[PDB]
């Protein structure tokens, strides 16, 4: 099975899984049960933008979901990714439906790392940023139901042809390259990523949510992970 | 008097102003009595590397030294830099020497700083990078004794022909600009810096150390500020 | 006097100085006239991009401003940078309007420069980002009528309460920090520049254009220079 | 067949294939024969670093190779990337040696291509940067000899234990991840990458030569494309 470190944007509550009573931001650390979460004030079909950052400094993952003029929704944890992650992962975005659903659609999505080895500017770095994205995305691993349309954006989960979401849908975009993390020999190991999402529904009640998620360079959509295992993980331990 | 948030490099046990008993990262808000520090192997004319980060999201600021195959040294501290600095501020480094001295060249040096506002993108950006630095650097303000060489060196301090440094020596560059650090609007307010620097000392005994600071937009070297106050505080409070 | 580089987007045809019969970019070197220009098919009331590159490995500088789902117009031409500026310089954005008028509204302004000397790695770099303009943006000099107004845009040109242009005005604005463009000694030299644009005019014929320069560290408004001269050039020669 | 677009560092002089009398800098453009040369002092055991640079704009790639303190060797000419190349490829270092040999090592590459699209600032990018490489380096596709060792360098050509050249090898090094280098609704595409080499040969003669390439992203090295085909080429035409 796969490792996983991801920020969640949860848009359902489920509380027999741990879930607060409210749509939330959390970050989950090898478990779809959240390590910390935050109340999130989701607004049904306008543009988002989330912002994750990492840095090896001071060990802790942050990110901060928001919506113009709105106030943010804010989580912090202590992480080290040496401790949970290979050296070398991919980076993607996942997002489900189950039986509630929702469009889980990607306007932007932008990733820079950076490791700093035992020397004085010894730095590699890579930086990715698609600010529509095309038909053929050949950059991009597109896994269960993603696709990018002629219409620029990435859909994670499944949207019929007027538009409306399907339920029981999973989908991820990982980005080609896989990214060297970690180094033991590293002074300074970081990482940011942004996107831009548009969630709608129909339904009085929108489900499951829209993930950035490091993993596995082999990271696979685990089998049955809709609704709230969000397309990261095989079960609800 | 000016507003100073600093990382302090710091050469010199000054125990009387609440300095450990041995040279220290620490991490000075509003005065040269550190708010946190951590042990500092420092090594007398080797390169070494410091990297100072800072993001909103988690509101902290931290700091590591190191040299080329040495263990680290770091330091983090909570910081609502809205709360501490003006909205526009200059960066710099400052050094100082007293009674004892040390070299305080800086061989490169960059910074970035990205402010994103109420919306999707809207995002403000500076960066600049010396990795080298001219006779005549006109996108630098020196301030004391500070001057950059023929050498392609900052020195911040004031150094003799023949190579060694004196005494009672206090000098500062800022970049030449104003920064955004803040503003009140922004979903992510966020910068980083590195600077590499080489500390030498003929004394048993080197002082006192270098700092990176962020300050007012018109601050100047306090006066009497040589020795402990490091170029940053008009006296020890 | 200033020495000038400048793209001149630019929307009156004064014939009798040079220009071509039709509204065009133009490659401008210490003079109005142009060395190089294109036909533009600028567009009344629509937001274009300009895009201006420079490197020292073919000694080029080009343009191209283009709209959405139209043809660009490109002008490119020949210049030793060494040969025509000092080495450090101020870059801008100037405006004017004379007897006829147009907004010449700025709603974002990126620039990058690099310039690596001798070594192999060895380089120096700023960059600064705007995507949007506070009310007061210190690290911009403003010359003449440029403001920044309530909307987050940099209004070159004298703008009246009802957005509407007016005649006879001229606006610069200067990034603060002087820029190093060449040095003896750099392998390559290069630079980058972008901004969107809002040229609107309840005439018949707009005027006079918009265009990016770099100039001496002190240059000012040469007088006399609105209308044709695009607050750049103290005669037409 | 492969298409391939290349910066030749070419240390052997092949007259009865095209080559001037002399190693040369060289643009191939689908051909060993190179479009423009221009004369290389290629200096035997010294690290230099090579530029390559491209925009749209003027539709120009030019290159200049470089050690401390010596002239530069450059070289310019016309391409349309839209018409010679796929829309997406492939980057990479080949290097080769054949009856004569040299060390073909790389200390350090970086790429960055940008192409904005139709609208006003959707550009897509992507960077990478190794100033190091690992035992393991998972974003890089090796082909034929091509290593990375254990003092942080790419051999892209086979070397003995005692760091001696050997011949008749040939060795490439992708980016992983496929490049969108071109797209017909961009209104400017353009790249640069920087590479720091160090060729050394206890010969008389040093061969073959280095190249940054772009290719189809199923590049493979052409059958005996050792030696004079740089790894590049099926044949001489
Ligand atoms: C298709 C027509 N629809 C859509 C209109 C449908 C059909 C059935 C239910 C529906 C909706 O909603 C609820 C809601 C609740 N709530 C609590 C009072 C409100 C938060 C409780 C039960 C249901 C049922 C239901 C009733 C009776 C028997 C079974 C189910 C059932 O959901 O089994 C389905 C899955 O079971 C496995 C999880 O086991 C522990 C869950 O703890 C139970 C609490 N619960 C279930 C759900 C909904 O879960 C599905 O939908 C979610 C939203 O997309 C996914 O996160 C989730 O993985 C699953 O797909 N939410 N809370
Ligand atoms: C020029 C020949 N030199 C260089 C060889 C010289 C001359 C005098 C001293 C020297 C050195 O060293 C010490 C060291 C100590 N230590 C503790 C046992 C060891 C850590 C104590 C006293 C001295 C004196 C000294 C003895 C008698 C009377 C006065 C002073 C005196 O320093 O007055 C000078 C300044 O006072 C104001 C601060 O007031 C509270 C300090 O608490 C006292 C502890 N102290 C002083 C110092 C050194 O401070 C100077 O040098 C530092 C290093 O550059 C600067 O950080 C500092 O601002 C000042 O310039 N370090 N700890
Ligand atoms: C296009 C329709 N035409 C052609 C029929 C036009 C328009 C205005 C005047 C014209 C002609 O003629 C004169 C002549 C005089 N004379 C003195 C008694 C006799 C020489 C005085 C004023 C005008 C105006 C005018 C009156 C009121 C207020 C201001 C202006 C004005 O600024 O004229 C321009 C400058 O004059 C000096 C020489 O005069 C002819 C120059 O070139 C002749 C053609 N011309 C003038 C203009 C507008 O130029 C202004 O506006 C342009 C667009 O904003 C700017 O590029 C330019 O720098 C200037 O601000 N465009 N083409
Ligand atoms: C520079 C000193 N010269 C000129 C006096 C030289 C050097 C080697 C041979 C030469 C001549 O001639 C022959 C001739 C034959 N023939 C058949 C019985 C008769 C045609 C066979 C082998 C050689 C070698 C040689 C012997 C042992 C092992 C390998 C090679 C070798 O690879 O030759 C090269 C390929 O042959 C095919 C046609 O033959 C002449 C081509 O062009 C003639 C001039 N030439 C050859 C070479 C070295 O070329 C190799 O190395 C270069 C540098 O590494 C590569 O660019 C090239 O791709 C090839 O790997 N450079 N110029
Ligand atoms: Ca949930
Ligand atoms: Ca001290
Ligand atoms: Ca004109
Ligand atoms: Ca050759
Ligand atoms: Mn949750
Ligand atoms: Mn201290
Ligand atoms: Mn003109
Ligand atoms: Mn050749």
Same mark, same amino acid.
């Given at each position: 099975?796969?490792?996983?470190?991801?920020?969640?944007?949860?848009?359902?509550?489920?509380?027999?899984?741990?879930?607060?009573?409210?749509?939330?931001?959390?970050?989950?650390?090898?478990?779809?049960?959240?390590?910390?979460?935050?109340?999130?004030?989701?607004?049904?079909?306008?543009?988002?933008?989330?912002?994750?950052?990492?840095?090896?400094?001071?060990?802790?993952?942050?990110?901060?979901?928001?919506?113009?003029?709105?106030?943010?929704?804010?989580?912090?944890?202590?992480?080290?990714?040496?401790?949970?992650?290979?050296?070398?992962?991919?980076?993607?975005? &996942? $997002?489900?439906?189950?039986?509630?659903?929702? *469009?889980? @659609?990607? !306007?932007?999505? +932008?990733?820079? %790392?950076?490791?700093?080895?035992?020397?004085?500017?010894?730095?590699?770095?890579?930086?990715?940023?698609?600010?529509?994205?095309?038909?053929?995305?050949?950059?991009?691993?597109?896994?269960?139901?993603?696709?990018?349309?002629?219409?620029?954006?990435?859909?994670?989960?499944?949207?019929?042809?007027?538009?409306?979401?399907?339920?029981?849908?999973?989908?991820?975009?990982?980005?080609?390259?896989?990214?060297?993390?970690?180094?033991? &020999? $590293?002074?300074?190991?970081?990482?940011?990523? *942004?996107? @831009?999402? !548009?969630?709608? +529904?129909?339904? %009085?009640?929108?489900?499951?949510?829209?993930?950035?998620?490091?993993?596995?360079?082999?990271?696979?959509?685990?089998?049955?992970?809709?609704?709230?295992?969000?397309?990261?993980?095989?079960?609800?331990?």
């Amino acid at each position: 099975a796969d490792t996983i470190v991801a920020v969640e944007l949860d848009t359902y509550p489920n509380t027999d899984i741990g879930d607060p009573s409210y749509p939330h931001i959390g970050i989950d650390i090898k478990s779809v049960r959240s390590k910390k979460t935050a109340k999130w004030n989701m607004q049904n079909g306008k543009v988002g933008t989330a912002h994750i950052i990492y840095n090896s400094v001071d060990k802790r993952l942050s990110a901060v979901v928001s919506y113009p003029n709105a106030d943010s929704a804010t989580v912090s944890y202590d992480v080290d990714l040496d401790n949970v992650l290979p050296e070398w992962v991919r980076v993607g975005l &996942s $997002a489900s439906t189950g039986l509630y659903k929702e *469009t889980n @659609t990607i !306007l932007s999505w +932008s990733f820079t %790392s950076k490791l700093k080895s035992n020397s004085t500017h010894e730095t590699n770095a890579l930086h990715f940023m698609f600010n529509q994205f095309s038909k053929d995305q050949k950059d991009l691993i597109l896994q269960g139901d993603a696709t990018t349309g002629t219409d620029g954006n990435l859909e994670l989960t499944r949207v019929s042809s007027n538009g409306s979401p399907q339920g029981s849908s999973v989908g991820r975009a990982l980005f080609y390259a896989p990214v060297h993390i970690w180094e033991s &020999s $590293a002074v300074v190991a970081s990482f940011e990523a *942004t996107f @831009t999402f !548009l969630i709608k +529904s129909p339904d %009085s009640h929108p489900a499951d949510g829209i993930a950035f998620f490091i993993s596995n360079i082999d990271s696979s959509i685990p089998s049955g992970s809709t609704g709230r295992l969000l397309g990261l993980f095989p079960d609800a331990n």
